[PDB]
Design a protein around this ligand. Structure first.
Ligand code: HEM
Ligand code: HEM
Lengths: 155, 151
């Protein structure tokens, strides 16, 4: 399924939501990416299965500073109309993960932790009505699980 | 990969939400057990990828039991029950080489149609409806991961 075909799936997903949701989310996620990357990394030390794959020094440069640009790839695609660029990024990361038999259930695990944590930021952000913080959190979960689905194409 | 460990995981995820969130969802899920199984199945036909793999009767009911299972776990505290079944379901899909990325496709689809129904439900304050939709998306994904075990 080429990135022309898989673009339209990202687009049609993002189109369930207003521009206000797209940007709202994007702003919160760039505002706190490095902090959201730390929280991710720590979450999968806590998991021993996942900790096996982290030799406690590989993140120093790679995993912390990379998880950042993932968060930008994902949350900008829609407000930029740059879908096939983003979708392409996801297959690379999916293929990287699959090459080293990183079990897919742990990715879905991580997708879920981020979603709970990004919504927690949306919640604690006082510059929004709870109606808005709600609708953004929805978008967040949808696009994460859209991305993860595509990351999962390499199995 | 013990169920006792897993069961515990189900408890914590759903502990993030109020009991009112658990029963509201269950209500709407079971109020539409048929229409939801019909939606999921017809959503597979649209795509060729899944349509590859499609007796419906067995399907139509076995989705209807999964739903009943997923939203029974928290309000009844039978986590082991609900887990053990997610474990089985995945191992079936597995041996058929049903690609993982699609179990997630229809998972996301059910979530979106479930919240639509929660938007429409005026027994609920919009606050609750959002809350409930969130529960629904989290717990589905939680099921999804457990299904995705040993793939
Ligand atoms: C939502 C979930 C996840 C996202 C968004 C994510 C993101 C990324 C990205 C962007 C890269 C860089 C790959 C590249 O472009 O070259 C990467 C690499 C990697 N990720 Fe993940 N990841 C996720 C889940 C996981 C999980 C659950 C583990 C658990 C073990 C993991 C372990 C790794 C490792 C080890 C590498 C580098 C491979 C190596 O050099 O040994 N990731 N990840
Ligand atoms: C969220 C996603 C899904 C859920 C919750 C789900 C649920 C179920 C359940 C509960 C069963 C009964 C398993 C058993 O008898 O023990 C089942 C069987 C089956 N599912 Fe799924 N399913 C999902 C996705 C898919 C997808 C994407 C396909 C794509 C083709 C698929 C095809 C089947 C087939 C063919 C069987 C029956 C196998 C057989 O009896 O020969 N399912 N599913």
């Amino acid at each position: 399924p080429s990135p022309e075909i898989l673009a339209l799936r990202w687009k049609d997903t993002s189109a369930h939501y207003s521009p206000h949701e797209w940007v709202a989310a994007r702003n919160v996620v760039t505002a706190n990416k490095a902090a959201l990357a730390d929280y991710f990394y720590e979450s999968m030390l806590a998991d021993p299965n996942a900790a096996f794959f982290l030799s406690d020094q590989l993140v120093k440069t790679k995993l912390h500073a990379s998880m950042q640009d993932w968060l930008e790839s994902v949350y900008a695609a829609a407000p930029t109309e740059e879908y096939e660029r983003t979708v392409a990024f996801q297959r690379k990361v999916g293929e990287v993960h699959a090459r080293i038999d990183i079990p897919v259930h742990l990715v879905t695990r991580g997708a879920s932790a981020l979603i709970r944590r990004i919504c927690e930021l949306l919640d604690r952000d006082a510059s929004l009505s709870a109606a808005q913080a709600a609708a953004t959190c929805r978008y967040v979960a949808d696009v994460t699980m859209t991305a993860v689905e595509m990351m999962s194409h390499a199995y």
